[PDB]
Each structure stands twice: as C-alpha cells, then as structure tokens.
Amino acid sequence: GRGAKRKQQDGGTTGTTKKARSDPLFSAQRLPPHGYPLEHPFNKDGYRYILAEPDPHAPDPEKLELDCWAGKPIPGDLYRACLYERVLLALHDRAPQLKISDDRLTVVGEKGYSMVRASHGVRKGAWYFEITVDEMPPDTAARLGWSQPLGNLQAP
DNA sequence: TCGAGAATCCCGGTGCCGAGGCCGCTCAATTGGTCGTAGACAGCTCTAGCACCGCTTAAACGCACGTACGCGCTGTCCCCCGCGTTTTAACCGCCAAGGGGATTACTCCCTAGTCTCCAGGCACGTGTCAGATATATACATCCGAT
C-alpha cells in the first residue's frame, strides 16, 4: 500500500518521468514551495510545466485514506507566477538558465547561450516597444527579435 | 529482483555567549662599548687499521626421506546480544563559606669565588696461578625390541 509513492517518485508509466532536470541556473520562478501556482521550465526544449489554474482528480488510487482532492479541493490564494495585462516577456515558455528580477524587468543569461520568449501575440495594433540593453560584455551575443514558440529555446 | 518501515541530512528560523578589537599602562630588549678569553691554526709523534698472503678445517651445501601437524571441513551447542521493560542518581542549576594559594617584604645566612699546600690514584713494571685444553669414564636418554 506504500508503493504508490515510490511509483510517483521513480516516474511511473504515464509518459514523461517524474524526475525533473533543469540543470542550468534557473531562477526568478518557482517561488511557493507547495501546491500552488508554479512553473518548471525543463531541460528538454519545448516542455512547459505549470500549476496555476488548478484542477481536482479522482480519489482512492489503491484503497488508502481518502484524499482531500476527491470532490472538494483545498483552496489557494497567494502569488501566481504569470502576468495578464502585457506579459513582460514570459514565465512559461522559457529556458531554465535566465535570471529575472522579482518585478520581471531585467534579464540575465547563462554562461552559455540562452533566450527568453513571451506569451502575447500580435495581430493588429501598434506595439512600438523597446529593449534597453543595460550592458553587453565581450563575447556576449545580444541578438534580439521576434520568434515563434516552435523555436528551440536553446538554439541560436 | 521488489516493497514498508526505519533511520539520517538538510532547510530554514531563532536566540545567545565566545573570539575579537580597541585603550591604557607598563618592563625588559636593544645599542654601544667594554674585557677578558676559548678555540682555531700549524706543527710534530705514534700507532694500528689495512693490504697481503698460507695453511688448516668447522662448517655450509644439498640431497634423501619419513612423518607431525596446519589446515580445511564437519558437526555441535551455548551464550551475547538486541529488544523490550522498570528504575534511579548524574547532571543541571542554584545557594554559602573559610581557607589557603599566590603575593609582599624582609633580614639573614649559605655559598661562589679566591687563594693555599699536600697527598693519592693512574701510568708502568713484574711475579704468578685459574681455568681453558685434551684424555677416560660412569651415567641418563632416544630409540627399538618385546
């Protein structure tokens, strides 16, 4: 009856394993260390993992004690890790090697190549915006421009 | 080859007394001469470790072998320990004291040092016997016979 936790820890057989790998310097995210609005950019380019907008699930996996998420999930009212009005870049489709401020204004890269994408599309209207390059040390490429989510977040 | 339970590591999260650094106030470490001297240089004397060889034999060399036991294996059985319990004084922190350990001051007396002469203990002969050396023997022991 205690094998369910081991199955959940090893990885199970539900597709991708339950053992995250984001080994570059990942910061500016994953603030609340509990079951709340969270995010995990993954090593594998193209993995977006988020917990905001929660959901219940079916209880009683292996006739253990009744889980609290049976029909009445626990509530949550705290920090949510995203932005609505105009996403300053993003917090979901990113690489786990980018350092951003708490207010999400500055972007600091890794020892190697890195990028940040956004989460807002443009179809009509004026979007005359700016990227103020605070500083650029030698051997630090600073190419900027629009791209697509299909783009590999670590590819040049 | 795989779980349940059981432990340890670490992330906070917080409160506290020990290493630290500054100020103030000493006491012994230099500096410079000064004075006596211990050892360094060169010479000469003597004596023995070394190179050398001769001849003799006690002992090392190496084979032969027959068995004593070191070792692997078995079985055995018994008691050390881990788990649990009840049981209790080491440890903590608090009191109070008197006594004696460390410090001050002092007078006094034991001793380093000098000078003094004489006597006894090591270098050096010299006579002499205690025990090693080789011979013959009663005896206790390993081995072999029953």
Side-chain angles (χ1 to χ4, degrees), chain A residues 27-43:
Chain A
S27 60
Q29 295 152 95
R30 199 90 102 91
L31 275 87
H34 277 336
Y36 296 123
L38 256 64
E39 68 267 63
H40 185 269
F42 211 110
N43 268 313

Side-chain angles (χ1 to χ4, degrees), chain A residues 10-132:
Chain A
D10 56 56
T13 41
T14 59
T16 67
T17 174
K18 285 167 268 300
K19 181 60 180 180
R21 284 198 181 90
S22 288
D23 76 289
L25 284 180
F26 150 74
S27 60
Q29 295 152 95
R30 199 90 102 91
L31 275 87
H34 277 336
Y36 296 123
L38 256 64
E39 68 267 63
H40 185 269
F42 211 110
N43 268 313
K44 298 171 273 200
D45 294 34
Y47 276 55
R48 314 166 163 175
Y49 282 19
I50 55 157
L51 184 42
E53 309 98 40
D55 55 329
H57 268 78
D60 202 290
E62 213 180 0
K63 274 88 61 180
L64 272 321
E65 300 286 334
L66 180 60
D67 300 330
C68 203
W69 288 1
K72 312 299 180 180
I74 49 179
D77 39 357
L78 50 99
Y79 185 77
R80 194 194 68 90
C82 182
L83 207 140
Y84 283 141
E85 294 84 8
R86 261 314 166 276
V87 275
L88 295 176
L89 294 180
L91 280 187
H92 318 291
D93 179 70
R94 277 187 40 193
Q97 43 182 16
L98 279 307
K99 299 103 177 180
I100 327 285
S101 60
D102 300 0
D103 42 68
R104 297 172 301 273
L105 257 65
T106 181
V107 179
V108 187
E110 204 59 27
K111 42 195 61 60
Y113 184 85
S114 307
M115 301 188 313
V116 261
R117 276 211 284 265
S119 180
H120 177 56
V122 283
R123 198 166 88 83
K124 78 115 179 180
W127 318 92
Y128 178 64
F129 79 96
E130 50 264 359
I131 311 177
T132 44

Side-chain angles (χ1 to χ4, degrees), chain A residues 135-152:
Chain A
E135 66 107 24
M136 192 269 313
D139 207 70
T140 71
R143 332 173 189 180
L144 323 175
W146 292 275
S147 168
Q148 314 282 328
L150 280 31
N152 300 330

